[PDB]
Assembly symmetry: D3
Homo-oligomer: 155 residues x 6
């Protein structure tokens, strides 16, 4: 069960909160895949290639994390990796009922596939991606919110 | 009262959750109108015609159910049908304060018009149209979440 | 479904919000039973006998409304009345997920039994028995929040 | 803290609930600035020019209120005004975790800045701009929802 | 309106989050009454008198704050103080709807009486009295959650 | 983190939802401690010693599960076991903000301690102990809600 975990998200862009989830889940799983979803339907600020790149940069220090981009269904991805656990992060503005709904839906698509939830550090519990984007977009400084190593990309 | 209720939605597509609500509310009113709102402001995956046709098939065997598409205010639709009851379904990811707000906005518009809520079966309380569309858009199989009569259409 | 609904509650005391729901739901069923549960496990300010008398006085003028006190499981009460509908009132402080949970817990005990929800008028949608008790217990005037018929008794 | 507050919003259009907050919060600070954000990401129905004008019109008779439009970060706006108070209104469908989040995001951008919350009158605690927009989109009458002096600009 | 604000609560015990609210709201009002309710029905861990002393001690450095104990209805207290503003704090576990409901109920009991909300610092937004009492009762150290000067009292 | 998890609760009585969480988290750590708290402040229907015994009986077939009763702080308990992870289950009626609060309060008391959340089967996601207690108290049958093993010890 601990062989491999998938932490999937849009990561638009990766923030300090995402990093705390990667930092702790990567302890539990021998390998942690960070799966960056295309999510074209959301309308991401940063492209799929830019978002993959930021998150690869911000996760170099984790030796067992590999980041991939993917365009299909997450449940099938997991089936490809032989993965039986999706990792999600829970924070203050988490839509908790939607997390449960998506966990059951992913399990109904792949009967092997569990969802497990982590928490970020308390300081980072109020960080969301959409605030970061709002800050960037009105040309403000969001460097206290996202890993310093991606800042020159999002600046 | 008793003589007619209207269960309005975007139904994009109709799911086993919406069918549960039709099944139950159709027991309480002589006639249940299933009303498919244009809802162009959301950006439905399926056209108004496709969504009417699908809910018509999935409701073929409910004797007292009649499906219609409409473009204007639901409050005015009710008035047209001499209807003083709107039907809504409550489920796990319902925005419950939004439901209340919509019910008082509707009564605002048509002073005789009450809102009444039913629940789906426990199995279908976690089904949402957006998860179903996310599945369908990423090539997944959503036939376990929508009535069998529509699968030839949404695939 | 059309002939009898039970609106069950502690009613400690009955409030303007509870009357709203009786008014509304009594329009939808041939008969509405207002069932006052013992609920001795809460620690009702008013006795079962007082809560029944209170709700009897405040409902005296509704033609199809009958009030009863009961001690056992509401699902068994419904069965005794050949009733397949439980009535609940949804308001601003409602614990919405607990409502669903109770609805399904009721159905698991009596497989025929559905729960249906009504709203009170907007003015009364913030009224709670808890606040009315707190007012009354701290010597304040609660008469704007409960039916006038009962005010003689709660003071 | 006593001298000035800024009530920021997209105001699309200004409704009776916004006005309540303006009335209430204008009573707590020597000067209130009503700041209309561009908010181009929310795709407003009404342009920034029209929303400024409508709020000016609706606020004309408050002695200590001035309205401004702004394109930049609200936290730098408050800096400009030597303001350490952001005013927000709390209503039934407020997403409360996200208000807290935004208050700490504003404070993480300008360290002296607090967010203070007021409530509207109870009758207006259910009004949202989203519902006004849906009403007028569907050429219904939302005149009971927005101040008389803006109605002709929105018909 | 800025003359006097009342910040009411059970304060069982006062925590760091309460003090953040007192710190900010005492900037807006020329006098801040911190009103310690008896709150019998909630079965406080600490007696009314003990709660009153802890909070008086924790708030002595705020020169325009006075703490009082009260047993009646808060809307009636505000009336005797000529106060038109109740101060409440909002945090992560706040029952938001219950705040709105009690704001309207206090308004319906006193027509001039508004409710205004503040936030604590982010580090203190997850502090609750009940978590403090849990720690105290199972004999752990909560000194990081309450003002340290009240620690020997608790 | 991979070696041990502690799933702490009042377990009053153990229900099919808790068993789901025990099944699931036991697949994620090499040992699972099911820790029965005294919780004298809650007012448990069953004594510590009954709730220990029922949970032992209900978990006797999980090979890597140990049940213990404890009176002190969970965070010290975790220390004494060289355990970095508390397991919690998330269900429909979870108070989500209070979980996150308790996770940060536990981590305040033992700086290495993480909280991880599992979901029960969808069918048991509406089961709570309080509703089981209510059924038992009112002499109804709650044997569909708690493991067969403990049913004799409940009625
Ligand atoms: C993209 C998916 C994973 C949704 O991801 P989401 O939009 O939530 O991504 P996002 O970048 O916002 O967040 C990433 C993860 O970190 C969590 N998180 C976000 N901010 C924080 C923070 N400050 N702290 C801790 N966790 C956080 C989120 O809860 C999530 O777990 C989902 O849409 C998906 O699976 N898409 C693929 C197609 C598919 O299979 N959909 C069918 C799903 S049933
Ligand atoms: C279309 C309307 C009714 C909103 O519908 P909504 O977007 O909620 O439709 P949707 O298809 O998502 O849901 C339909 C109904 O099924 C319920 N439901 C959805 N999924 C489920 C499920 N699994 N189980 C049970 N019920 C469910 C919904 O709560 C709703 O009651 C509304 O926007 C409307 O009235 N539009 C017309 C214009 C108008 O008058 N607007 C003014 C509103 S004041
Ligand atoms: C007594 C029962 C129904 C729960 O009642 P509850 O405590 O919600 O009673 P209360 O008097 O608070 O409310 C009565 C009803 O009016 C609603 N309501 C309350 N205030 C308002 C208001 N201002 N406006 C509209 N509705 C209102 C409640 O939501 C409920 O629908 C329940 O505990 C029960 O069924 N007891 C019997 C034993 C049993 O069978 N329990 C098993 C449950 S699985
Ligand atoms: C525009 C801002 C303030 C968000 O505003 P919002 O979308 O909430 O505006 P809106 O017009 O919807 O509401 C205005 C205010 O009235 C409140 N409100 C709305 N309806 C009601 C009602 N019926 N009663 C009481 N209050 C109400 C809202 O809660 C809000 O406080 C925010 O996007 C912002 O600051 N933008 C500027 C750029 C910036 O600095 N962004 C980064 C933020 S970290
Ligand atoms: C005691 C009253 C004020 C309610 O108090 P409450 O239980 O919320 O007190 P508590 O001690 O828990 O909290 C005190 C205040 O600080 C806030 N708060 C608590 N923790 C924190 C924190 N970490 N950060 C910020 N604020 C916080 C609470 O929201 C509240 O604003 C109410 O019961 C009351 O008025 N009682 C008197 C009788 C009365 O008039 N009742 C009728 C009311 S309609
Ligand atoms: C006892 C503790 C763990 C709280 O337990 P709680 O009251 O939640 O136990 P309860 O028996 O309700 O539930 C047990 C666990 O199963 C979960 N759960 C309950 N029902 C279900 C269900 N249907 N499905 C899934 N999970 C469920 C609960 O969420 C919880 O995770 C807490 O009080 C504690 O740690 N006490 C020890 C003293 C201590 O250290 N306290 C200070 C904490 S900061």
């Amino acid at each position: 069960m601990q062989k491999i975990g998938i932490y999937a998200g849009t990561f638009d862009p990766v923030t300090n909160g995402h990093i705390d989830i990667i930092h702790r889940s990567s302890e539990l799983f021998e390998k942690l895949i960070v799966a960056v979803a295309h999510s074209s339907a959301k309308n991401p600020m940063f492209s799929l290639d830019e978002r993959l790149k930021m998150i690869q940069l911000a996760t170099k220090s984790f030796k067992n994390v590999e980041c991939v981009a993917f365009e299909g269904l997450l449940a099938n991805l997991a089936k490809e990796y032989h993965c039986k656990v999706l990792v999600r992060g829970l924070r203050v503005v988490s839509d908790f009922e939607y997390e449960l709904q998506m966990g059951y839906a992913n399990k109904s698509l792949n009967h092997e596939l569990e969802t497990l939830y982590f928490m970020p550090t308390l300081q980072n519990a109020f960080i969301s991606s959409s605030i970061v984007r709002s800050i960037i977009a009105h040309k403000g400084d969001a460097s206290h919110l996202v890993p310093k190593e991606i800042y020159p990309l999002i600046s």
